[PDB]
Amino acid sequence: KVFGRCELAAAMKRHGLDNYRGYSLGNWVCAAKFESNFNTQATNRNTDGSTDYGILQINSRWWCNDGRTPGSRNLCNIPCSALLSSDITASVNCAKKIVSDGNGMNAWVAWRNRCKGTDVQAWIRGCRL
Ligand SMILES: [Cl-]
């Protein structure tokens, strides 16, 4: 599923991401835009052989099991395919664990490079929330 900007904002808010660990909703929408272009089915392979999955590009090296990343962990306790669902619940629940691990949203490279320090409120502008 390819979300609309405001559609995704409302889904994330309903799932408890607004101001989660101090990160306003606009940060999460911005991250999703540049990680996946709002596409729940996005996948990308990394150099080390791990793969990033879903709307927030969660890495199989640490967070999910895809059966093909030897010596990796599965900290969210889920198959990586669950992160590709049109229902964003699994992605959000796993993102909450990631952002709580000490490094905040800096875990997301596109957030650090393209959202951090910008006017992220612009990403939820005009939305009915
Ligand atoms: Cl933080």
Distance from Cα 70 to the centre of ligand 1, integer Å? 30
Cβ–Cβ < 8 Å for 83, 91: yes
**Residue 101 assigned ligand-binding role:** yes
Structure-solving method: X-ray
List the domain boundaries for the chain.
Answer: 1-129
Domain covering 1-129, topology:
Lysozyme (1.10.530)
Cβ–Cβ < 8 Å for 83, 94: yes
Catalytic residue list: 35, 52
Distance from Cα 12 to the centre of ligand 1, integer Å? 18
Distance from Cα 6 to the centre of ligand 1, integer Å? 24
Resolution of the experimental model, in Å, one decimal? 1.9
Whole-number Cα distances in Å, 64 to 13, 34, 38, 125: 23, 21, 20, 33
